[PDB]
Amino acid sequence: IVLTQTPAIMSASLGERVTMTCTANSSVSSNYFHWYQQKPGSSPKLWIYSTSNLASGVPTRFSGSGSGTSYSLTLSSMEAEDAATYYCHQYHRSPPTFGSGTKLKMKRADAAPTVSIFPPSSEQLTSGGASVVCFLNNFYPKDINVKWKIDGSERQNGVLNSWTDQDSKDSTYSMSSTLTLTKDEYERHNSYTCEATHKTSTSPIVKSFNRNEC
Amino acid sequence: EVKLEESGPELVKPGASMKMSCKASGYTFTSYIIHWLKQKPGQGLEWIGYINPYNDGSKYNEKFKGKATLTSDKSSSTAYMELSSLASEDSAVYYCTRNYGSDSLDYWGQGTTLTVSSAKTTPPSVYPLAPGSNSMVTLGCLVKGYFPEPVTVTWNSGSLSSGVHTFPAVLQSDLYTLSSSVTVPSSTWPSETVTCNVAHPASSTKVDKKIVPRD
Ligand SMILES: *[C@@H]1O[C@H](CO)[C@@H](O)[C@H](O)[C@H]1NC(C)=O
Ligand SMILES: [K+]
């Protein structure tokens, strides 16, 4: 039995009411309809059982309702610890099935990235590789563009980017950008610059490392 | 306290099989059904089947009734799942979870990360990230060249609120790159020792890397 969750992704500011829905392709008994919450890197947690009963420890701002094919989870007042993915579950028939999820994010104030650049360690240089790392920490919203410049020319190859999900405390994103070259290629250039474009500044937020200053 | 403890992460070759375990403690093992579920990165949950340790009966998703075999050992209060003839698309986190009232899933194992791949298990190289030659200073560790997932990173530092970020790993050419940043008051470092501690359970290795200032 297919369960379709909507919206797939949504954001709410603190204190706002949030409702998410799960629609089944067939009727399912309300006694065998459940909700789970999952945070990145962790197991799912039973959140609501039999449509409207809160699991042990679940804050009272949550509720659930529904019958037939349409079910909903409502959060009366969005709070920071509520940012997570929520899944519906039917066990009306075997096999039991789960929704594709509603990822609920926290809206917050714009924050500029704090940029930090790091040269290759002497330890990595013995391996025949060289990585330059740029952290772009504690920014909002998630939308950001990172460019690497080597002695003024853009470098696009050998760049690995990764983003955290919203920080538990301040709800910002962070991003890591790693430029990896061969040691030979690394030693043919002087300066390595990571440049961040973000809505909080009309100018890029940049940091550079020069080989001659170190 | 009810606990479901799953076996560690493993790498398995295409065409081989895997067997993973889920050790139950703190309740009557034989009184509750255990379910097994699959979760691919960035997807929802898919149910594989259940084991009833009371009568040794297992029920399967028709999709999985060929591939999966669920068993349990009453002697050790342990449920097991065998997955046979594996391919790349069997790579996922697998959970065991306890069937409760109205077949809600109340207690969950921590997950077992299964990677199916032709590549070799390789331990990480860990490199210190120290500033080149402010009241706050950001340092980090670069965790390169390992396979498979996961690794864990823990810091010994004076990090501030929202001051630790460990980035999800990125795969490239059968090897993962992960990084982690820590932001500490500039009075604490290089004064006090800051260390990133990396574990890679699939290769049974760890690394304790001190962040030394560049000379
Ligand atoms: C279930 O319903 C959704 C939404 O109407 C539809 O797109 C999908 O095709 C349906 N699936 C099946 C297997 O009938
Ligand atoms: K050490």
Residue B171 belongs to domain with CATH number: 2.60.40.10
Mutate to test the pocket of ligand 1, among A25, A88, A90 (most ligand atoms within 8 A of CB): A25
Residues B69 and B156 reside in one and the same domain:
no
Residue B61 and residue B66: Cα distance in Å, rounded? 10
Number of H helices, E strands in chain B: 0, 19
Do A166 and A106 meet the contact criterion of CB atoms below 8 Å apart?
yes
Residue A119 and residue A211: Cα distance in Å, rounded? 8
Residues B28 and B86 reside in one and the same domain:
yes
Q: How far is CA A47 from CA A12, A54, A55, A60, A78, in A?
A: 19, 6, 5, 11, 16
Ligand 1 contact, A25 CB (< 6 A): yes
Q: Map out the domains of chain A with their CATH numbers.
A: 1-108 (2.60.40.10), 109-211 (2.60.40.10)
Q: What is the least distance, in Å, from the CA of B183 to any CA of chain A?
A: 9
Q: Residue B211: helix, strand or coil by DSSP?
A: coil
Residues B81 and B33 reside in one and the same domain:
yes
Ligand 1 contact, A9 CB (< 6 A): no
Phi and psi at residue B73, to the nearest 5°: -120, 105
Instruction: Tell me how far the alpha carbon of residue A106 lies from the centroid of ligand 1, in angstroms.
Output: 30
Residue B60 and residue B205: Cα distance in Å, rounded? 36
Residues B114 and B62 reside in one and the same domain:
yes
Residues B6 and B97 reside in one and the same domain:
yes
Ligand 1 contact, A2 CB (< 6 A): yes
> CB distance B162–A133 less than 8 Å?
no
Lookup: tokens for A106: 């926290």
Where a domain ends, among B118, B133, B168? B118
Residue B192 and residue B38: Cα distance in Å, rounded? 44
Burial of A31 (0-12, 13-18, 19+ CB in 10 A): middle
Residue A160 and residue A163: Cα distance in Å, rounded? 10
Burial of B141 (0-12, 13-18, 19+ CB in 10 A): buried
> CB distance A121–B129 less than 8 Å?
yes
Q: Alpha carbon B39 to chain centroid distance?
A: 12
Residues B113 and B124 reside in one and the same domain:
no
- Taking alpha carbons only, the member of A56, A59, A91 closest to residue A74 is A59
Query: What b-and-e string marks burial along B177-190, b requiring 16 or more CB atoms within 10 Å of the CB?
Result: bbbbbbbbbeebbe
Amino acid at B92: A
Residues B88 and B140 reside in one and the same domain:
no
Where a domain ends, among B63, B96, B118? B118
Beta bridge partners of B170: B177
Residues B71 and B127 reside in one and the same domain:
no
Residues B149 and B206 reside in one and the same domain:
yes
Any idea what DSSP says for residue B121? P
Residues B131 and B107 reside in one and the same domain:
no
- Taking alpha carbons only, the member of B153, B140, B146 closest to residue B198 is B153
- Is the preceding peptide bond at A95 cis, omega within 30 degrees of 0? yes
Residues B36 and B87 reside in one and the same domain:
yes
Task: State the resolution, in angstroms.
Answer: 1.9
Residues B85 and B176 reside in one and the same domain:
no
Least CB-CB distance to B165: which of A101, A118, A164? A164
Where a domain ends, among B118, B145, B160? B118
On the CB side of B36, how many CA atoms lie within 13 Å of its CA? 31
Residue with tokens 């410049």: A149
Rounded to the nearest 5 degrees, what angle is found at the Cα of A191, between the Cα atoms of A190 and A193? 165
Number of structural domains, chain B?
2
Domain that residue B4 falls in? 1-118
Residue B85 and residue B14: Cα distance in Å, rounded? 7
Q: What is the least distance, in Å, from the CA of A96 to any CA of chain B?
A: 7
Query: Method of determination?
Result: X-ray
Q: What is the least distance, in Å, from the CA of A163 to any CA of chain B?
A: 6
Judging contacts by C-beta atoms under 8 Å, the chain A residues touching residue B168 are 40, 162-164
Q: How far is CA A138 from CA A195, A206, B162, B168, B185, in A?
A: 16, 15, 8, 16, 16
